[PDB]
Symmetry: C2
Subunit: 488 residues, 2 copies
């Protein structure tokens, strides 16, 4: 297997994946434009197929061009690597404002460069996995981060007291001396081949100071750079997880966390660049008090972890509520708030197509489109597999029944209120439908009525419930684990 053939395969697969994503993009845009025409009538805006802007910044950001000449690109890249002259082209960088007031600098390399990065740095990560720490993730959406969450959750539940602290490694990775990185190349038993060292040094030479964040090379270079920090924190006995440019360190002892702070600074001085906490707190039971500055629950990647349970962060709950409310608004209010309702089917005959579309959109967003019979069949044993899609799939570890029950109530209440406003708007337009099915139900009846309603032999009006899919998620976690339910 020659290197040129390997580069060919990698570049071609990356290009094909991007092409497939764009094809599905424009197909989705067309299907949605057809549905939106049906929804907003003549007011429906016209389709607008966009192509990513960075496709034009360089021709090699474009999947279609790279697929046009991936053989020549791979040929030249292999020759440049063999002659040790290869240097990656500049990536597209956009500065996104971090909510904490910082700046996260994304880097989108060109398809050839990204392909080479994956080919080599996935190999280096696989070859050196046992030298790296446990809970080290390059992205804050990585599916494996929940393992770290699980650990902290378990610890929080068991430990009488859990001291925690947080750190921002953003500036560390923005400006870390590449000479320090190079000093780590032959330490901690890392198996880095000479050609791999050339590719690492080439991607670093393309940069000037710091490691590119959010890239195929980020995880490996971070682990290689922070290997001594990880070793010192493990020798102290604290547990830690690095996700992107954030690090959480928790322990059962105050002295241990203090010494961890000391370790981070010894590492900061040795690296030439400082690491600053977001800082330190104690997590205890809600009833019991604290001696040091403390909070009841930590917020860790969309989870509010407490000594009593794991729940969804209020920001994440707000996002869920935003999506559900906008589903209902888009399908049941926005069309009726236009200047003309021409081409928009007005509900009649005890049938609202808009309400079915909205309930189904909410069901897709939450369950992934599952029926309550499917979920109950999984919960009973009748069925041995239930696909776990939707928003709850991203919160597999939630065990807060009260939160999900409250969100159930909120879903029902918002359905009632939006339907009432839809009736009011319809009546303004001159279509009395209050007595009809979708607008006559009282709130304390919606669920029941919609549960009984059937169309095409399938109950497509049932109001989706977070608690049912939570039951299923708990069973699926106890039967398959986290990794098997966050992707099929």
């Amino acid at each position: 297997m020659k290197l040129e053939q390997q580069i060919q395969r990698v570049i071609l697969e990356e290009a094909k994946a991007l092409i497939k994503d764009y094809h599905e993009y424009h197909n989705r845009v067309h299907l949605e434009s057809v549905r939106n025409k049906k929804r907003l009538g003549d007011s429906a805006p016209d389709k607008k197929i966009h192509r990513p802007n960075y496709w034009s910044f360089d021709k090699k950001f474009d999947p279609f061009y790279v697929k046009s000449n991936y053989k020549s690109i791979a040929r030249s890249i292999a020759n440049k690597i063999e002659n040790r002259t290869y240097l990656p082209n500049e990536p597209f960088t956009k500065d996104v404002p971090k909510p904490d007031g910082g700046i996260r600098k994304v880097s989108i390399y060109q398809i050839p460069d990204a392909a080479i990065s994956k080919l080599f740095f996935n190999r280096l990560l696989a070859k050196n996995r046992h030298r790296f720490s446990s809970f080290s993730y390059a992205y804050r959406n990585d599916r494996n981060v929940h393992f770290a969450i699980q650990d902290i959750s378990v610890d929080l539940k068991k430990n009488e007291r859990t001291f925690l602290a947080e750190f921002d490694f953003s500036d560390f990775f923005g400006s870390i001396s590449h000479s320090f990185l190079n000093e780590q190349f032959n330490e901690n038993g890392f198996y880095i081949s000479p050609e791999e060292k050339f590719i690492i040094r080439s991607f670093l030479r393309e940069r000037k100071v710091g490691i590119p964040q959010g890239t195929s090379i980020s995880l490996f270079l971070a682990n290689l750079t922070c290997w001594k920090l990880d070793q010192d924190l493990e020798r102290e006995g604290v547990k830690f997880s690095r996700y992107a440019d954030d690090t959480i360190i928790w322990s059962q002892e105050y002295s241990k966390i203090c010494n961890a702070f000391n370790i981070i600074t010894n590492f900061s001085k040795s690296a030439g660049i400082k690491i600053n906490p977001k800082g330190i707190s104690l997590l205890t039971k809600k009833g019991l008090p604290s001696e040091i500055t403390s909070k009841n629950n930590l917020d860790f990647l969309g989870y509010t972890l407490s000594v009593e349970n794991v729940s969804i962060k209020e920001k994440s709950v707000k996002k869920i509520k935003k999506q559900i409310s906008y589903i209902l608004y888009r399908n049941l209010i926005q069309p009726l708030k236009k200047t003309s309702l021409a081409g928009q089917t007005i509900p009649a005959n005890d049938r609202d197509k808009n309400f079915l579309i909205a309930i189904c959109e909410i069901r897709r967003y939450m369950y992934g489109g599952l029926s309550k019979s499917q979920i109950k069949d999984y919960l009973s044993g009748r069925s041995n597999r239930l696909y776990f899609k939707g928003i709850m799939s991203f919160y597999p570890l939630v065990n807060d029944v009260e939160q999900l029950k409250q969100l159930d109530g909120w879903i029902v209440s918002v359905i009632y209120r939006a339907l009432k406003l839809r009736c009011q708007l319809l009546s303004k337009w001159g279509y009395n439908r209050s007595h009809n099915f979708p607008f006559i139900l009282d709130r304390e009846d919606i669920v029941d009525k919609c549960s009984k309603k059937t169309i095409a032999g399938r109950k497509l009006f049932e109001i989706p419930s977070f608690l049912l899919i939570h039951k299923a998620l708990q069973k699926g976690l106890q039967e398959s684990g986290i990794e098997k339910i966050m992707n099929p």
Copy 2:
């Protein structure tokens, strides 16, 4: 995917693997009997195809019977699991004498029970991998134990003073209360499903006290029973590895090792059964002295690990020498020590077929059959892949050039001496061949002459060298890692 179908697949695959192994066994026996006929002439023993004894102790130990009625076996096993009456049949148990003076009780379950054990306990180990420790292995031949070795090796090289201690958990797993095991079923975030709990309890009920060792269920149950010991040792800051019923705990601090001893004592008390050391020592540079009872090098699974290098254990070197010496003896002396040399080709015309067979046997044992051109192409870059088979494949981490150089000298010397004895014996039988090629070379010439010799255009007289394949092993470790060279 129903449970019966899953059991069917597993039982059939296990039976087929065993059948394939037996077929290859008798085919090998025949090929070797043909070669041995050629070697020992009329004195050659007759073939004797054996079948494993345990195949007859129960019909389900026999792969062929299980393949005969694997459908009925799977049907009944699935029904028994669903009705929660399944109980594994007694395994075959032979008590082997451990060199330390102990007894290792191996357990060979029947093909159905082994298949079920794999099906469920591999799932459990995968689903709970992140809850387990790093260096936990169920066999002392597991390919991943070398990662643990690598870790300690690195530590030894970097640390001045590496306090080590060793522990025997043999009696712990021989008699651990199954109630303690059951108490751990709902701890450390372990995801164990109800059916998995039934299967664990069934395999335990089949036993009475302790965990079966050397089985598919050994690793998981050992991790589940020792999870709190692992957590305590990790909080202390010591690093440890459990291989089978052996545990090595190392640290850079004496206080940490002493506190680890205290932890093991407490865990022994909480389990109702004691854990005894083999005990506590300090590993330092060869030149520098020590305070406490100390040794220059620890012996860990075929490795003599020192602060200066990693070498092969003297017992393992003895084993290598035994195999090479017997190869030469069998092919060059034993046939000539028989009563009659009838049917045995006597060397003449400057060709010794026996010497070629012996050199090729040694090459297979050492290199795996590689040519020195293949190894030099890998070492140079001409060739990008060299399969790593033979004895050195089991010692991928050796970096002791002196040991390999000494073994090179020993190979050349033993070749010379065995050839000289072959010449003497041949002359007794009345066949003077001292002037001929295989009996004329001086020791300090053997390699050179054998290097230049060629047959079929390929140099199959070259004396195999440990150091060349060590160069190749080092390059392959720096290019592919441990996991990729211990199995292709």
